[PDB]
Design a protein around this ligand. Sequence first.
Ligand SMILES: Cc1cc2nc3c(=O)[nH]c(=O)nc-3n(C[C@H](O)[C@H](O)[C@H](O)COP(=O)(O)O)c2cc1C
Ligand SMILES: Cc1cc2nc3c(=O)[nH]c(=O)nc-3n(C[C@H](O)[C@H](O)[C@H](O)COP(=O)(O)O)c2cc1C
Lengths: 208, 209
Amino acid sequence: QDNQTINLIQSRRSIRKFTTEQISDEQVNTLLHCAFAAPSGCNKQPWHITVVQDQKLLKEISDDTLSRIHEVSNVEINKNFKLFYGAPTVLFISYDESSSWAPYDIGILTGNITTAAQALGLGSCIIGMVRGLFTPVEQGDIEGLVSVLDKEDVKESESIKMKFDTNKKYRELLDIPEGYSVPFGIAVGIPDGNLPNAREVVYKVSRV
Amino acid sequence: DNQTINLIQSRRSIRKFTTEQISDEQVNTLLHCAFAAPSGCNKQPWHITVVQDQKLLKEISDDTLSRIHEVSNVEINKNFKLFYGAPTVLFISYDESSSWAPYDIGILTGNITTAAQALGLGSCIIGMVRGLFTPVEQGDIEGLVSVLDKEDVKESESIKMKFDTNKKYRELLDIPEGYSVPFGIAVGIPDGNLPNAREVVYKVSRVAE
Ligand SMILES: Cc1cc2nc3c(=O)[nH]c(=O)nc-3n(C[C@H](O)[C@H](O)[C@H](O)COP(=O)(O)O)c2cc1C
Ligand SMILES: Cc1cc2nc3c(=O)[nH]c(=O)nc-3n(C[C@H](O)[C@H](O)[C@H](O)COP(=O)(O)O)c2cc1C
Protein backbone atom coordinates (compact mmCIF):
# COMPACT_ATOMS: atom_id res chain seq x y z
CA GLN A 1 0.00 0.00 0.00
CA ASP A 2 0.88 3.74 0.32
CA ASN A 3 1.29 2.90 4.02
CA GLN A 4 5.01 3.39 4.65
CA THR A 5 5.23 0.67 7.37
CA ILE A 6 3.52 -1.96 5.18
CA ASN A 7 5.77 -1.12 2.28
CA LEU A 8 8.97 -1.57 4.36
CA ILE A 9 7.80 -4.89 5.75
CA GLN A 10 6.79 -6.20 2.32
CA SER A 11 9.92 -4.97 0.58
CA ARG A 12 12.47 -6.08 3.15
CA ARG A 13 15.49 -8.00 2.00
CA SER A 14 18.78 -9.07 3.63
CA ILE A 15 21.63 -6.63 3.12
CA ARG A 16 24.99 -8.14 2.55
CA LYS A 17 26.94 -5.18 1.16
CA PHE A 18 27.52 -2.15 3.41
CA THR A 19 29.49 1.10 3.36
CA THR A 20 32.38 1.54 5.84
CA GLU A 21 30.44 4.29 7.64
CA GLN A 22 29.45 3.49 11.27
CA ILE A 23 25.85 4.02 12.35
CA SER A 24 25.16 6.73 14.96
CA ASP A 25 24.66 6.10 18.67
CA GLU A 26 21.17 7.48 18.27
CA GLN A 27 20.36 4.89 15.60
CA VAL A 28 21.80 2.23 17.92
CA ASN A 29 19.59 3.45 20.76
CA THR A 30 16.59 3.46 18.50
CA LEU A 31 17.21 -0.10 17.36
CA LEU A 32 17.53 -1.19 20.99
CA HIS A 33 14.46 0.64 22.06
CA CYS A 34 12.53 -1.01 19.24
CA ALA A 35 13.99 -4.41 20.07
CA PHE A 36 13.04 -4.28 23.75
CA ALA A 37 9.55 -3.09 22.95
CA ALA A 38 8.71 -6.55 21.59
CA PRO A 39 6.05 -8.75 23.16
CA SER A 40 7.20 -11.91 24.98
CA GLY A 41 5.47 -14.91 26.53
CA CYS A 42 4.46 -13.89 30.11
CA ASN A 43 6.35 -10.66 29.69
CA LYS A 44 9.54 -12.49 30.78
CA GLN A 45 11.63 -10.64 28.16
CA PRO A 46 14.08 -13.55 28.33
CA TRP A 47 16.67 -12.03 26.06
CA HIS A 48 19.85 -10.05 25.94
CA ILE A 49 21.62 -8.04 23.25
CA THR A 50 25.30 -7.35 22.93
CA VAL A 51 26.22 -4.36 20.73
CA VAL A 52 29.50 -5.04 18.99
CA GLN A 53 31.54 -2.46 17.01
CA ASP A 54 34.97 -4.03 17.55
CA GLN A 55 36.03 -5.19 14.06
CA LYS A 56 38.89 -7.29 15.50
CA LEU A 57 36.55 -9.36 17.59
CA LEU A 58 34.07 -9.71 14.61
CA LYS A 59 36.96 -10.76 12.39
CA GLU A 60 37.99 -13.39 14.94
CA ILE A 61 34.45 -14.84 15.11
CA SER A 62 34.31 -14.84 11.29
CA ASP A 63 37.68 -16.62 11.02
CA ASP A 64 36.77 -19.25 13.63
CA THR A 65 33.43 -19.87 12.04
CA LEU A 66 34.78 -20.37 8.52
CA SER A 67 37.60 -22.47 9.87
CA ARG A 68 35.15 -24.73 11.79
CA ILE A 69 32.99 -25.02 8.68
CA HIS A 70 36.06 -25.95 6.57
CA GLU A 71 37.29 -28.56 9.08
CA VAL A 72 33.98 -30.30 9.92
CA SER A 73 32.20 -30.26 6.50
CA ASN A 74 35.23 -30.00 4.17
CA VAL A 75 33.94 -27.16 2.00
CA GLU A 76 36.33 -24.47 0.76
CA ILE A 77 35.21 -20.86 1.32
CA ASN A 78 37.19 -17.97 -0.23
CA LYS A 79 39.54 -16.55 2.45
CA ASN A 80 38.26 -13.04 1.62
CA PHE A 81 34.70 -14.01 2.85
CA LYS A 82 33.35 -11.98 5.79
CA LEU A 83 30.77 -13.72 7.98
CA PHE A 84 29.27 -10.33 8.87
CA TYR A 85 29.61 -8.82 5.38
CA GLY A 86 31.79 -6.01 6.74
CA ALA A 87 28.93 -4.49 8.75
CA PRO A 88 30.17 -1.76 11.08
CA THR A 89 27.81 -2.90 13.95
CA VAL A 90 26.54 -6.33 14.97
CA LEU A 91 23.87 -7.08 17.60
CA PHE A 92 24.40 -10.56 19.19
CA ILE A 93 21.05 -11.94 20.37
CA SER A 94 20.93 -14.31 23.33
CA TYR A 95 18.11 -15.99 25.17
CA ASP A 96 17.18 -18.02 28.19
CA GLU A 97 17.26 -21.65 27.19
CA SER A 98 14.94 -22.58 30.07
CA SER A 99 12.05 -20.47 28.72
CA SER A 100 9.77 -22.33 26.41
CA TRP A 101 8.66 -19.13 24.53
CA ALA A 102 12.07 -17.53 24.34
CA PRO A 103 13.15 -18.69 20.85
CA TYR A 104 9.90 -17.21 19.44
CA ASP A 105 10.32 -14.12 21.58
CA ILE A 106 13.71 -13.30 20.17
CA GLY A 107 12.48 -13.77 16.63
CA ILE A 108 9.85 -11.14 17.32
CA LEU A 109 12.50 -8.90 18.84
CA THR A 110 14.72 -9.50 15.76
CA GLY A 111 11.78 -8.51 13.54
CA ASN A 112 11.48 -5.22 15.40
CA ILE A 113 15.18 -4.57 14.96
CA THR A 114 14.98 -5.46 11.22
CA THR A 115 11.99 -3.24 10.43
CA ALA A 116 13.40 -0.39 12.54
CA ALA A 117 16.71 -0.47 10.69
CA GLN A 118 14.76 -0.20 7.42
CA ALA A 119 12.80 2.75 8.82
CA LEU A 120 16.09 4.50 9.66
CA GLY A 121 17.49 4.07 6.15
CA LEU A 122 19.79 1.27 7.29
CA GLY A 123 19.84 -2.44 6.27
CA SER A 124 20.59 -5.73 8.03
CA CYS A 125 21.24 -9.40 7.66
CA ILE A 126 20.81 -11.97 10.38
CA ILE A 127 23.87 -14.15 10.89
CA GLY A 128 23.72 -17.68 12.27
CA MET A 129 26.29 -18.56 14.93
CA VAL A 130 28.12 -21.90 15.30
CA ARG A 131 26.69 -23.27 18.53
CA GLY A 132 29.96 -25.01 19.36
CA LEU A 133 31.80 -21.68 19.56
CA PHE A 134 29.32 -20.07 22.01
CA THR A 135 28.21 -22.84 24.27
CA PRO A 136 28.78 -22.43 27.93
CA VAL A 137 31.63 -24.45 29.22
CA GLU A 138 29.37 -26.64 31.39
CA GLN A 139 27.49 -27.84 28.29
CA GLY A 140 29.97 -30.53 27.23
CA ASP A 141 33.40 -29.01 27.61
CA ILE A 142 34.06 -30.26 31.14
CA GLU A 143 33.98 -34.06 30.40
CA GLY A 144 35.91 -33.08 27.22
CA LEU A 145 38.78 -31.71 29.26
CA VAL A 146 38.52 -34.74 31.55
CA SER A 147 38.80 -37.24 28.77
CA VAL A 148 41.74 -35.38 27.22
CA LEU A 149 43.83 -35.99 30.35
CA ASP A 150 43.99 -39.67 29.55
CA LYS A 151 44.67 -38.98 25.88
CA GLU A 152 47.96 -37.21 26.43
CA ASP A 153 48.83 -35.28 23.24
CA VAL A 154 46.61 -36.10 20.36
CA LYS A 155 45.14 -33.59 17.85
CA GLU A 156 41.59 -34.23 19.01
CA SER A 157 43.03 -33.26 22.38
CA GLU A 158 44.33 -29.86 21.34
CA SER A 159 40.98 -28.87 19.72
CA ILE A 160 39.08 -29.65 22.97
CA LYS A 161 41.32 -27.15 24.81
CA MET A 162 40.77 -24.49 22.10
CA LYS A 163 36.97 -25.02 22.14
CA PHE A 164 36.97 -24.41 25.94
CA ASP A 165 39.10 -21.29 25.60
CA THR A 166 37.03 -19.99 22.68
CA ASN A 167 33.76 -20.65 24.49
CA LYS A 168 34.99 -18.89 27.63
CA LYS A 169 36.44 -15.98 25.62
CA TYR A 170 33.35 -15.24 23.47
CA ARG A 171 30.85 -15.63 26.27
CA GLU A 172 32.86 -13.24 28.50
CA LEU A 173 33.57 -10.65 25.84
CA LEU A 174 29.89 -10.55 24.80
CA ASP A 175 28.74 -10.65 28.41
CA ILE A 176 26.36 -13.47 27.75
CA PRO A 177 24.18 -14.17 30.72
CA GLU A 178 24.47 -17.53 32.53
CA GLY A 179 22.28 -20.19 30.97
CA TYR A 180 21.74 -18.19 27.75
CA SER A 181 22.25 -19.48 24.26
CA VAL A 182 23.56 -17.19 21.42
CA PRO A 183 21.95 -18.45 18.19
CA PHE A 184 22.58 -15.51 15.89
CA GLY A 185 23.68 -11.92 15.44
CA ILE A 186 22.23 -9.09 13.31
CA ALA A 187 24.67 -7.27 11.11
CA VAL A 188 23.57 -3.67 10.79
CA GLY A 189 24.86 -0.90 8.48
CA ILE A 190 24.34 1.60 5.70
CA PRO A 191 23.65 -0.34 2.51
CA ASP A 192 26.09 0.16 -0.35
CA GLY A 193 24.14 0.52 -3.58
CA ASN A 194 20.54 -0.05 -4.44
CA LEU A 195 18.42 -2.36 -2.36
CA PRO A 196 17.65 -5.89 -3.73
CA ASN A 197 14.22 -6.30 -5.25
CA ALA A 198 11.34 -7.15 -3.05
CA ARG A 199 10.59 -10.84 -2.44
CA GLU A 200 7.82 -12.37 -4.56
CA VAL A 201 6.04 -13.92 -1.60
CA VAL A 202 4.70 -17.40 -1.41
CA TYR A 203 1.33 -17.79 0.40
CA LYS A 204 1.71 -20.82 2.63
CA VAL A 205 -1.84 -20.50 3.87
CA SER A 206 -5.03 -22.51 4.66
CA ARG A 207 -8.48 -20.93 5.24
CA VAL A 208 -11.71 -21.69 7.12
CA ASP B 1 8.86 11.70 13.79
CA ASN B 2 9.09 8.40 11.97
CA GLN B 3 5.73 6.61 11.96
CA THR B 4 7.17 3.07 11.75
CA ILE B 5 9.52 3.67 14.77
CA ASN B 6 6.64 5.14 16.86
CA LEU B 7 4.44 2.15 16.09
CA ILE B 8 7.03 -0.44 17.12
CA GLN B 9 7.84 1.54 20.27
CA SER B 10 4.15 2.01 21.25
CA ARG B 11 2.93 -1.49 20.57
CA ARG B 12 0.83 -3.30 23.12
CA SER B 13 -1.09 -6.55 23.27
CA ILE B 14 -4.75 -5.75 22.66
CA ARG B 15 -7.37 -7.86 24.39
CA LYS B 16 -10.68 -6.08 23.64
CA PHE B 17 -12.02 -5.78 20.14
CA THR B 18 -15.17 -4.48 18.41
CA THR B 19 -17.47 -6.96 16.73
CA GLU B 20 -16.51 -5.71 13.21
CA GLN B 21 -14.70 -8.26 10.99
CA ILE B 22 -11.49 -7.13 9.32
CA SER B 23 -11.57 -6.85 5.53
CA ASP B 24 -10.19 -9.50 3.17
CA GLU B 25 -7.60 -6.97 1.98
CA GLN B 26 -6.40 -6.45 5.57
CA VAL B 27 -6.18 -10.21 5.91
CA ASN B 28 -4.17 -10.35 2.72
CA THR B 29 -1.83 -7.54 3.69
CA LEU B 30 -1.13 -9.31 7.06
CA LEU B 31 -0.23 -12.45 5.10
CA HIS B 32 1.92 -10.69 2.57
CA CYS B 33 3.85 -9.11 5.50
CA ALA B 34 4.10 -12.39 7.33
CA PHE B 35 5.44 -14.14 4.28
CA ALA B 36 8.04 -11.41 3.62
CA ALA B 37 10.02 -12.24 6.77
CA PRO B 38 13.64 -13.34 6.66
CA SER B 39 14.14 -17.08 7.05
CA GLY B 40 17.20 -19.20 7.90
CA CYS B 41 18.42 -20.86 4.63
CA ASN B 42 15.39 -19.36 2.88
CA LYS B 43 13.37 -22.40 3.99
CA GLN B 44 10.33 -20.32 4.85
CA PRO B 45 9.20 -23.30 6.94
CA TRP B 46 5.96 -21.84 8.10
CA HIS B 47 2.23 -22.01 7.58
CA ILE B 48 -0.71 -19.90 8.55
CA THR B 49 -4.32 -21.01 9.04
CA VAL B 50 -6.81 -18.10 8.85
CA VAL B 51 -9.92 -18.71 11.00
CA GLN B 52 -12.94 -16.38 11.03
CA ASP B 53 -15.58 -18.96 11.96
CA GLN B 54 -16.66 -18.05 15.53
CA LYS B 55 -18.16 -21.55 16.06
CA LEU B 56 -14.78 -23.18 15.47
CA LEU B 57 -13.03 -20.62 17.69
CA LYS B 58 -15.45 -21.35 20.55
CA GLU B 59 -14.79 -25.11 20.27
CA ILE B 60 -10.99 -24.42 20.32
CA SER B 61 -11.37 -22.15 23.29
CA ASP B 62 -13.56 -24.71 25.10
CA ASP B 63 -11.17 -27.61 24.30
CA THR B 64 -8.18 -25.64 25.48
CA LEU B 65 -9.95 -25.18 28.83
CA SER B 66 -10.93 -28.88 28.97
CA ARG B 67 -7.40 -29.77 28.17
CA ILE B 68 -6.23 -27.70 31.15
CA HIS B 69 -8.74 -29.36 33.43
CA GLU B 70 -7.48 -32.88 32.38
CA VAL B 71 -4.00 -32.23 33.80
CA SER B 72 -4.91 -30.14 36.88
CA ASN B 73 -7.45 -29.11 39.49
CA VAL B 74 -8.33 -25.76 37.69
CA GLU B 75 -11.83 -25.58 36.16
CA ILE B 76 -12.13 -22.49 33.93
CA ASN B 77 -15.56 -21.28 33.01
CA LYS B 78 -16.40 -22.04 29.37
CA ASN B 79 -17.92 -18.52 28.80
CA PHE B 80 -14.35 -17.16 28.91
CA LYS B 81 -13.10 -16.20 25.47
CA LEU B 82 -9.61 -17.50 24.85
CA PHE B 83 -9.18 -15.18 21.90
CA TYR B 84 -10.70 -12.12 23.57
CA GLY B 85 -13.54 -12.12 21.00
CA ALA B 86 -11.25 -11.32 18.09
CA PRO B 87 -13.05 -11.89 14.74
CA THR B 88 -9.93 -13.32 13.05
CA VAL B 89 -7.35 -15.71 14.49
CA LEU B 90 -4.17 -16.74 12.58
CA PHE B 91 -2.83 -20.08 13.70
CA ILE B 92 0.89 -20.24 13.22
CA SER B 93 2.59 -23.56 12.51
CA TYR B 94 6.06 -24.65 11.43
CA ASP B 95 8.44 -27.38 10.45
CA GLU B 96 10.64 -28.43 13.36
CA SER B 97 13.06 -30.00 10.78
CA SER B 98 14.66 -26.61 10.12
CA SER B 99 16.94 -25.59 12.98
CA TRP B 100 16.24 -21.88 12.31
CA ALA B 101 12.45 -22.28 12.23
CA PRO B 102 11.49 -21.08 15.73
CA TYR B 103 13.33 -17.86 15.13
CA ASP B 104 11.85 -17.50 11.62
CA ILE B 105 8.39 -17.93 13.09
CA GLY B 106 9.02 -15.21 15.75
CA ILE B 107 10.01 -12.80 12.95
CA LEU B 108 7.00 -13.75 10.91
CA THR B 109 4.86 -13.13 14.00
CA GLY B 110 6.47 -9.74 14.55
CA ASN B 111 5.82 -8.72 10.96
CA ILE B 112 2.15 -9.59 11.45
CA THR B 113 2.01 -7.75 14.79
CA THR B 114 3.53 -4.57 13.35
CA ALA B 115 1.52 -4.77 10.14
CA ALA B 116 -1.66 -5.00 12.21
CA GLN B 117 -0.79 -1.80 14.01
CA ALA B 118 -0.02 -0.13 10.72
CA LEU B 119 -3.51 -0.97 9.41
CA GLY B 120 -5.36 0.53 12.38
CA LEU B 121 -5.68 -2.87 13.97
CA GLY B 122 -4.43 -4.62 17.11
CA SER B 123 -3.41 -8.13 18.16
CA CYS B 124 -2.62 -10.50 20.96
CA ILE B 125 -0.47 -13.59 20.60
CA ILE B 126 -2.33 -16.56 22.19
CA GLY B 127 0.14 -19.25 23.36
CA MET B 128 -2.35 -21.27 25.32
CA VAL B 129 -3.42 -23.05 22.14
CA ARG B 130 -0.21 -25.03 21.96
CA GLY B 131 -1.62 -27.04 24.84
CA LEU B 132 -4.07 -28.58 22.36
CA PHE B 133 -1.15 -30.33 20.52
CA THR B 134 1.41 -30.95 23.17
CA PRO B 135 1.21 -31.61 26.86
CA VAL B 136 -0.26 -28.66 28.73
CA GLU B 137 2.41 -26.74 30.52
CA GLN B 138 2.13 -25.59 34.10
CA GLY B 139 3.46 -22.09 33.45
CA ASP B 140 0.84 -21.55 30.73
CA ILE B 141 -1.89 -22.43 33.17
CA GLU B 142 -0.62 -20.02 35.75
CA GLY B 143 -0.16 -17.37 32.98
CA LEU B 144 -3.83 -17.74 32.10
CA VAL B 145 -5.22 -17.98 35.71
CA SER B 146 -3.39 -14.66 36.43
CA VAL B 147 -5.69 -12.82 34.00
CA LEU B 148 -9.16 -14.31 34.90
CA ASP B 149 -11.93 -12.93 36.92
CA LYS B 150 -11.83 -14.88 40.09
CA GLU B 151 -15.54 -15.68 39.43
CA ASP B 152 -14.36 -17.51 36.29
CA VAL B 153 -12.14 -20.02 38.14
CA LYS B 154 -12.76 -22.87 40.55
CA GLU B 155 -10.65 -25.74 41.88
CA SER B 156 -12.20 -29.09 41.03
CA GLU B 157 -11.07 -32.68 40.34
CA SER B 158 -9.53 -33.52 36.97
CA ILE B 159 -11.72 -34.70 34.12
CA LYS B 160 -10.42 -36.95 31.31
CA MET B 161 -11.36 -36.05 27.77
CA LYS B 162 -13.33 -38.25 25.41
CA PHE B 163 -11.14 -37.43 22.37
CA ASP B 164 -7.73 -36.26 21.04
CA THR B 165 -7.46 -32.44 20.53
CA ASN B 166 -4.16 -32.87 18.64
CA LYS B 167 -5.71 -35.01 15.87
CA LYS B 168 -8.91 -33.03 15.86
CA TYR B 169 -7.17 -29.67 15.30
CA ARG B 170 -4.38 -30.96 13.09
CA GLU B 171 -7.25 -31.82 10.68
CA LEU B 172 -9.63 -28.87 11.19
CA LEU B 173 -6.76 -26.33 10.93
CA ASP B 174 -5.19 -28.18 8.01
CA ILE B 175 -1.83 -28.19 9.79
CA PRO B 176 0.92 -29.65 7.57
CA GLU B 177 2.15 -32.96 8.73
CA GLY B 178 4.58 -32.90 11.61
CA TYR B 179 4.39 -29.07 12.00
CA SER B 180 4.47 -27.61 15.52
CA VAL B 181 1.79 -25.16 16.44
CA PRO B 182 3.06 -22.73 19.09
CA PHE B 183 0.31 -20.15 19.16
CA GLY B 184 -2.49 -18.29 17.46
CA ILE B 185 -2.61 -14.57 16.81
CA ALA B 186 -5.89 -12.81 17.64
CA VAL B 187 -6.51 -9.82 15.38
CA GLY B 188 -9.24 -7.22 15.33
CA ILE B 189 -10.27 -3.62 15.57
CA PRO B 190 -9.40 -2.44 19.04
CA ASP B 191 -12.44 -1.43 21.15
CA GLY B 192 -11.42 1.92 22.58
CA ASN B 193 -8.43 4.19 22.21
CA LEU B 194 -4.99 2.66 22.21
CA PRO B 195 -3.14 2.10 25.51
CA ASN B 196 0.09 3.93 26.33
CA ALA B 197 3.50 2.47 25.65
CA ARG B 198 4.98 0.41 28.55
CA GLU B 199 8.31 1.00 30.28
CA VAL B 200 11.13 -0.45 28.14
CA VAL B 201 14.04 -2.17 29.86
CA TYR B 202 17.42 -2.48 28.13
CA LYS B 203 18.91 -5.98 28.63
CA VAL B 204 22.09 -4.94 26.86
CA SER B 205 25.84 -5.04 26.96
CA ARG B 206 28.34 -3.22 24.81
CA VAL B 207 31.59 -3.93 23.13
CA ALA B 208 34.23 -1.36 22.11
CA GLU B 209 35.25 0.02 18.62
C1 LIG C 1 4.99 -16.21 22.42
C2 LIG C 1 3.97 -15.39 23.16
C3 LIG C 1 2.89 -16.01 23.78
C4 LIG C 1 1.90 -15.23 24.41
N1 LIG C 1 0.83 -15.86 24.93
C5 LIG C 1 -0.14 -15.09 25.41
C6 LIG C 1 -1.40 -15.77 25.84
O1 LIG C 1 -1.68 -16.96 25.78
N2 LIG C 1 -2.33 -14.88 26.21
C7 LIG C 1 -2.19 -13.54 26.31
O2 LIG C 1 -3.14 -12.88 26.75
N3 LIG C 1 -1.03 -12.94 26.00
C8 LIG C 1 -0.06 -13.68 25.52
N4 LIG C 1 1.08 -13.07 25.09
C9 LIG C 1 1.20 -11.60 25.22
C10 LIG C 1 2.11 -11.23 26.39
O3 LIG C 1 1.51 -11.48 27.67
C11 LIG C 1 2.53 -9.76 26.32
O4 LIG C 1 3.28 -9.61 25.13
C12 LIG C 1 3.41 -9.26 27.48
O5 LIG C 1 2.66 -9.47 28.69
C13 LIG C 1 3.83 -7.81 27.42
O6 LIG C 1 2.67 -6.98 27.23
P1 LIG C 1 2.59 -6.05 25.87
O7 LIG C 1 2.46 -7.12 24.64
O8 LIG C 1 1.29 -5.15 26.02
O9 LIG C 1 3.88 -5.21 25.83
C14 LIG C 1 2.05 -13.82 24.46
C15 LIG C 1 3.19 -13.24 23.89
C16 LIG C 1 4.10 -14.00 23.19
C17 LIG C 1 5.27 -13.33 22.52
C1 LIG D 1 17.83 -17.27 11.80
C2 LIG D 1 18.43 -16.78 10.51
C3 LIG D 1 19.77 -16.97 10.26
C4 LIG D 1 20.37 -16.43 9.10
N1 LIG D 1 21.69 -16.59 8.94
C5 LIG D 1 22.24 -16.03 7.87
C6 LIG D 1 23.71 -16.15 7.73
O1 LIG D 1 24.35 -16.70 8.58
N2 LIG D 1 24.17 -15.56 6.62
C7 LIG D 1 23.41 -14.90 5.68
O2 LIG D 1 24.01 -14.42 4.70
N3 LIG D 1 22.08 -14.79 5.82
C8 LIG D 1 21.51 -15.34 6.87
N4 LIG D 1 20.19 -15.23 7.03
C9 LIG D 1 19.41 -14.52 6.01
C10 LIG D 1 18.65 -15.50 5.13
O3 LIG D 1 19.56 -16.21 4.28
C11 LIG D 1 17.62 -14.77 4.28
O4 LIG D 1 16.58 -14.25 5.09
C12 LIG D 1 16.99 -15.68 3.21
O5 LIG D 1 18.05 -16.18 2.38
C13 LIG D 1 15.98 -14.97 2.35
O6 LIG D 1 16.61 -13.80 1.82
P1 LIG D 1 15.95 -12.36 2.12
O7 LIG D 1 16.08 -12.16 3.71
O8 LIG D 1 16.90 -11.34 1.40
O9 LIG D 1 14.48 -12.23 1.73
C14 LIG D 1 19.58 -15.74 8.16
C15 LIG D 1 18.21 -15.56 8.42
C16 LIG D 1 17.65 -15.99 9.60
C17 LIG D 1 16.19 -15.75 9.87
